[PDB]
Amino acid sequence: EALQGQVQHLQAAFSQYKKVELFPNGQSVGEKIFKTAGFVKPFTEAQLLCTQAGGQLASPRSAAENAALQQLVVAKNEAAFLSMTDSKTEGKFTYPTGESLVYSNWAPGEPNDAGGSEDCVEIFTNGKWNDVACGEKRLVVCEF
Amino acid sequence: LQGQVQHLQAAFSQYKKVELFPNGQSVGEKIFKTAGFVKPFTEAQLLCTQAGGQLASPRSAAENAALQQLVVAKNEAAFLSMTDSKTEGKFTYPTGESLVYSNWAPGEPNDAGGSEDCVEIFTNGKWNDVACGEKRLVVCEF
Amino acid sequence: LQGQVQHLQAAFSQYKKVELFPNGQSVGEKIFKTAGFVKPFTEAQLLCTQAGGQLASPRSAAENAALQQLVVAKNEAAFLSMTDSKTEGKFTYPTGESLVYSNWAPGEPNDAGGSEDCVEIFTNGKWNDVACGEKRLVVCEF
Ligand SMILES: OC[C@H]1O[C@H](O[C@@H]2[C@@H](O[C@H]3[C@@H](O)[C@H](O)[C@@H](CO)O[C@@H]3O)O[C@H](CO)[C@@H](O)[C@@H]2O)[C@@H](O)[C@@H](O)[C@@H]1O
Ligand SMILES: OC[C@H]1O[C@H](O[C@@H]2[C@@H](O[C@H]3[C@@H](O)[C@H](O)[C@@H](CO)O[C@@H]3O)O[C@H](CO)[C@@H](O)[C@@H]2O)[C@@H](O)[C@@H](O)[C@@H]1O
Ligand SMILES: OC[C@H]1O[C@H](O[C@H]2[C@@H](O)[C@H](O)[C@@H](CO)O[C@@H]2O)[C@@H](O)[C@@H](O)[C@@H]1O
Ligand SMILES: [Ca+2]
Ligand SMILES: [Ca+2]
Ligand SMILES: [Ca+2]
Ligand SMILES: [Ca+2]
Ligand SMILES: [Ca+2]
Ligand SMILES: [Ca+2]
Ligand SMILES: [Ca+2]
Ligand SMILES: [Ca+2]
Ligand SMILES: [Ca+2]
Ligand SMILES: [Ca+2]
Numbered sequence: 001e002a003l004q005g006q007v008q009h010l011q012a013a014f015s016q017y018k019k020v021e022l023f024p025n026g027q028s029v030g031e032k033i034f035k036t037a038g039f040v041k042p043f044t045e046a047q048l049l050c051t052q053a054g055g056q057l058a059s060p061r062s063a064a065e066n067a068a069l070q071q072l073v074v075a076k077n078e079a080a081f082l083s084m085t086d087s088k089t090e091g092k093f094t095y096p097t098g099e100s101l102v103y104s105n106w107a108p109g110e111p112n113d114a115g116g117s118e119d120c121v122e123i124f125t126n127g128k129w130n131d132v133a134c135g136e137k138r139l140v141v142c143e144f
Numbered sequence: 145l146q147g148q149v150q151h152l153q154a155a156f157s158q159y160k161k162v163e164l165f166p167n168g169q170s171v172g173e174k175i176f177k178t179a180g181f182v183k184p185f186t187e188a189q190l191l192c193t194q195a196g197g198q199l200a201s202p203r204s205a206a207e208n209a210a211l212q213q214l215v216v217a218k219n220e221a222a223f224l225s226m227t228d229s230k231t232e233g234k235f236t237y238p239t240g241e242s243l244v245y246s247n248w249a250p251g252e253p254n255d256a257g258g259s260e261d262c263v264e265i266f267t268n269g270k271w272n273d274v275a276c277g278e279k280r281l282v283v284c285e286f
Numbered sequence: 287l288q289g290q291v292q293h294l295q296a297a298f299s300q301y302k303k304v305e306l307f308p309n310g311q312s313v314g315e316k317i318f319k320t321a322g323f324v325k326p327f328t329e330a331q332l333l334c335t336q337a338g339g340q341l342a343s344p345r346s347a348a349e350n351a352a353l354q355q356l357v358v359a360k361n362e363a364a365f366l367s368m369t370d371s372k373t374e375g376k377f378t379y380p381t382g383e384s385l386v387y388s389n390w391a392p393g394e395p396n397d398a399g400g401s402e403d404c405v406e407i408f409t410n411g412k413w414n415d416v417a418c419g420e421k422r423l424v425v426c427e428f
Pocket of ligand 4: 091116119120128
């Protein structure tokens with residue numbers, strides 16, 4: 001009825017604002033949304049900002065999701081932090097839920113745990129991953 | 145249709161979260177959002193009103209703390225909407241009513257030089273009456 | 287349920303307002319949003335298209351004035367979507383149709399050096415055909 005008309009007018013308007021939101025610091029892949037803050041921070045600060053924002057750090061679980069996140073990295077020309085760490089068990093990277101990686105896109109020779117102190121993961125402009133020290137400043141990208 | 149509205153709040157709640165990052169803060173049904181730049185009061189008041197809202201007007205300790213976070217993130221003191229321009233010494237909201245909450249810094253308000261009618265909020269959340277001509281961070285509320 | 291859906295329009299209308307501040311402008315059913323930075327035409331045109339829209343395409347004085355404010359706010363001339371790349375002298379929208387509105391500055395378009403095929407908009411709302419390789423403000427429309 002009349003209400004049914006109100007909602008279809010709403011999805012129309014909402015879909016337009018979805019597009020407006022993701023410009024220029026957002027990327028949607030499936031039902032997941034990546035958004036970057038535009039600046040660089042250490043892991044702990046990046047993880048904090050993302051969690052208080054109601055989400056978490058970028059967690060690519062597929063090639064499609066990895067490609068979408070990659071576009072933000074290319075656009076900002078800055079390697080970004082991922083949520084996965086091997087702090088608990090060295091060599092074994094896990095999501096915040098604790099489960100093991102269901103997808104990875106390591107660069108050649110990575111992860112190498114360089115200096116025996118590389119426990120966080122970053123993504124380059126080519127979409128490849130590298131384990132890097134969590135104290136380094138990288139692009140803050142959250143997922144919602 | 146009944147399912148579609150339930151599907152809609154789900155998407156909207158997600159878009160809600162995406163929107164407020166990283167320049168927004170929600171406290172209750174109020175939303176603080178910063179422009180990222182500094183302006184004199186008249187321009188700040190202007191930009192917020194044309195945007196469909198008004199300058200940041202914290203009415204509780206919770207709201208003041210949320211607004212404070214936007215200030216800390218930008219490392220820039222921000223303008224509030226309240227002024228004692230009409231009646232000196234008595235600061236009021238745009239509606240004209242008196243302050244229902246205040247967090248003045250020690251010794252403030254002092255009306256320094258006899259020409260301080262606007263209010264700014266520091267990175268520590270404390271308030272200070274400052275000249276309206278000064279450039280401070282633009283933070284609106286919606 | 288009807289109360290629940292109108293409660294949704296209320297929340298969306300608020301987030302509508304939050305979204306457009308401070309880099310957005312809505313005129314009619316069109317939304318202009320700026321990226322805040324400058325890029326060459328091809329890069330600007332690219333960013334807009336992958337974002338789900340296209341470059342700023344003012345079709346009326348009302349739309350042109352709204353786009354103008356983003357330019358004023360950033361103090362940087364912005365690229366429009368219209369070009370005379372196909373047939374020199376004949377500017378067209380991405381759809382291929384001829385201009386239904388123009389606000390050319392005095393003496394424009396002049397195709398200076400025989401190599402000006404893109405259009406920029408100044409802080410005064412006037413248009414100028416300029417070389418597409420130049421870096422201008424990126425403003426898209428949705
Ligand atoms: O813009 C400088 C300073 O202004 C604000 O602090 C103010 C300052 O007053 C100064 C001076 O600005 C004023 O003209 C004379 C008038 O006799 O008094 C002082 O020399 O300091 C007082 C006391 O600390 C403040 O109450 C007053 O607001 C403030 O925005 C500050 O952040 C800023 O650097
Ligand atoms: O980036 C410089 C200037 O570009 C735009 O104005 C252009 C400018 O043309 C130049 C030059 O390229 C041309 O060969 C000679 C012809 O006599 O004129 C100028 O030296 O100025 C003309 C007329 O003023 C414009 O039509 C032309 O677009 C513009 O973006 C401007 O803001 C900028 O400074
Ligand atoms: O911060 C310097 C450097 O750190 C990272 O690369 C280091 C290491 O993690 C790699 O395994 C090796 C081999 O490629 O190179 C470095 O030692 C990267 O984040 C890199 O971009 C950065 O410059
Ligand atoms: Ca490790
Ligand atoms: Ca380790
Ligand atoms: Ca490494
Ligand atoms: Ca006074
Ligand atoms: Ca005063
Ligand atoms: Ca004072
Ligand atoms: Ca936004
Ligand atoms: Ca030509
Ligand atoms: Ca031309
Ligand atoms: Ca010209």
